[PDB]
């Protein structure tokens, strides 16, 4: 019922670029949310990608942003408990 016309990869990148700006600004709450939004799009880009070289690059970048988002989350859990 909806055609999936847009590029999930470039949407994911758009959201990660925003996350990076927020992360740099120490706006970690907002950055964390931006990262996970970006990652949901990159995960779908990965699931549906048919070029193995492209999949390899998407995987490498996904992992990097996921590592960072996980760090932010632990930090926020720490501030929340304290």
């Amino acid at each position: 019922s909806h055609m999936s016309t847009g590029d999930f990869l470039t949407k994911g990148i758009e959201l990660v670029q925003k996350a990076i700006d927020l992360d740099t600004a120490t706006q970690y709450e907002e950055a964390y949310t931006a990262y996970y939004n970006g990652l949901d799009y990159l995960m779908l880009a990965l699931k549906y990608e048919k070029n193995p070289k492209s999949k390899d690059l998407i995987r490498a970048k996904f992992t990097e942003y996921l590592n960072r988002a996980e760090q932010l989350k632990k930090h926020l859990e720490s501030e929340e408990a304290n």
Partner: protein, 41 residues
């Protein structure tokens, strides 16, 4: 205090803008597992 230095455990792996540039012109199992964990609460 109003301000605090960013903690060293957050500084060290801070992104540079360059990481997300030039990727796209405008194995997966453990990755989806970690994303599932990340989004909760």
């Amino acid at each position: 205090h109003m301000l605090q230095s960013t903690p060293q455990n957050l500084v060290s792996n801070a992104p540079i803008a360059e990481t997300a540039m030039g990727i796209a012109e405008p194995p997966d199992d453990d990755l989806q597992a970690r994303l599932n964990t990340l989004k909760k609460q």
